[PDB]
């Protein structure tokens, strides 16, 4: 079993990778970081590098990290998805607050 995704890396290089289906995200997020780094040098990009207390993990496009303990098949990842590799410093805190207003009035109020 396998799945294929665009794994984004530094400054927006699209890279494509082959990943296992059933092993959980934490057990692969280390080795995947090698091959993204091994390729990055051949494009002439710097490998992924940052400082401060924290770590690397896989993310969705809004900054949300995935669950560390479950298959990509237990989350909904399927062939041709896109994901980010990102630096999660200790300072990181996320909003998680959503609000309702007529999308028709906000857009128009910008000019009304």
């Amino acid at each position: 079993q396998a799945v294929v995704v665009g794994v984004m890396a530094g400054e927006g290089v699209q890279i494509g990778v082959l990943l296992d289906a059933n092993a959980p995200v934490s057990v692969m997020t280390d080795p995947l970081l090698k091959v993204v780094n091994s390729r990055l040098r051949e494009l002439g990009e710097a490998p992924l590098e940052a400082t401060g207390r924290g770590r690397w993990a896989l993310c969705l496009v809004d900054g949300a990290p995935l669950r560390a303990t479950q298959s990509l098949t237990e989350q909904d990842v399927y062939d041709g998805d896109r994901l980010w590799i990102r630096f999660i410093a200790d300072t990181e805190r996320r909003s998680q607050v959503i609000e309702h207003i007529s999308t028709a009035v906000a857009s128009d109020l910008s000019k009304r």
């Binding site: 079993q1 396998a2 294929v4 399927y78 062939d79 041709g80």
Partner: protein, 339 residues
């Protein structure tokens, strides 16, 4: 790992309505004659409204089957995907949108009886009935098409940005509109740096981008050499041909291609030469020529049978074309799905 996809019964297409129309016979040669002239004009406008309505039915029908290539991605999940069928009745199997252009309406005009002799025709109605036939005999901007089933190959001749623009638009139209069990696709190419986006699409799989003819000959030609020579089919014939049509793309300029080409192909295949090599480009019935502005020219073909009507090449389509990025964006979205 892929999502399942079961295809429904098709949605009902917008019906085309024919019109058998017999023209206004001209006036034959003061305050009376204007009333005669003015009535003739107004009967003509009511034929125009009959024409315009029948033209609108044809626009709706053809767009509903052959969308613009950039819209294809948003449609990808819907039951409009993988809709086309081989089984005889479907006229659009093997037909692919190559651009936009002219086509001839479903009106069928009857010549005006008792036509006055050239010296006897009245001036105003004469020219008016003439222009009406010149312009209302065609409808502008419909999706122009090529049939795979009609010719062994189609030489693409032009600068690289254009030829590769067209070829990727063709590839993803086939991929959206025809399923993988009905169309399979091969590249033989040296610029593997153009055919990377093709990783994703399922139609490029098999039960397959290749570097030179010697290589293709071993894996693919061992299958594809196996039989035949080209035999132009049609919609009703489509019921009999075995399910996967192959499209093969030749991009390398190797002389080793002489064997299959001088032999007049095989059934189940269709070549596009992207190079412009002389072995492919010697038959005007089989050649698409690109102006710098992307206007393609070819011999004219019949709307209903695709048979060639003339030996002089003429306007055919304004090309629509997709970049390597847009192709890969579409390619990933499709890569998600399976039977």
């Amino acid at each position: 790992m892929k999502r399942g996809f079961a295809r429904p019964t098709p949605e009902k297409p917008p019906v085309i309505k024919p019109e058998n129309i017999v023209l206004s016979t001209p006036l034959s040669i003061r305050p009376k004659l204007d009333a005669m002239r003015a009535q003739f004009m107004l009967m003509l406008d009511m034929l125009r409204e009959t024409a315009q309505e029948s033209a609108d039915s044809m626009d709706a029908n053809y767009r509903w089957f052959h969308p613009a290539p950039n819209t294809l991605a948003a449609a990808v999940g819907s039951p409009r995907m993988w809709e086309r069928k081989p089984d005889g009745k479907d006229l659009n199997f093997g037909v692919v949108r190559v651009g936009v252009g002219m086509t001839r309406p479903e009106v069928t005009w009857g010549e005006p009886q008792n036509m006055p002799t050239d010296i006897e025709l009245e001036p105003v109605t004469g020219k008016a009935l003439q222009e009406f036939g010149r312009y209302q005999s065609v409808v502008y901007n419909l999706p122009k098409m090529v049939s795979l089933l009609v010719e062994p190959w189609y030489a693409l001749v032009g600068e690289r940005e254009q030829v590769l623009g067209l070829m990727r638009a063709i590839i993803c139209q086939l991929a959206f509109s025809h399923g993988p069990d009905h169309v399979q696709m091969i590249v033989v190419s040296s610029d593997l740096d153009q055919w990377d986006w093709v990783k994703w699409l399922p139609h490029f799989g098999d039960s397959m981008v290749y570097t030179s003819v010697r290589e293709f000959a071993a894996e693919q030609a061992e299958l594809f050499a196996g039989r035949g020579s080209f035999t132009p089919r049609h919609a009703s014939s489509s019921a009999q041909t075995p399910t996967p049509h192959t499209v093969i793309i030749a991009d390398v300029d190797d002389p080793q291609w002489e064997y299959v080409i001088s032999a007049e192909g095989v059934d189940g295949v269709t070549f596009f030469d992207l190079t412009g090599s002389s072995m492919w480009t010697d038959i005007p019935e089989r050649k698409l020529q690109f102006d710098k502005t992307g206007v393609i020219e070819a011999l004219p073909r019949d709307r209903d049978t695709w048979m060639v009507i003339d030996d002089k090449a003429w306007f055919f389509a304004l090309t629509d074309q997709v970049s390597i990025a847009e192709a890969e964006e579409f390619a990933q979205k499709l890569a998600q799905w399976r039977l």
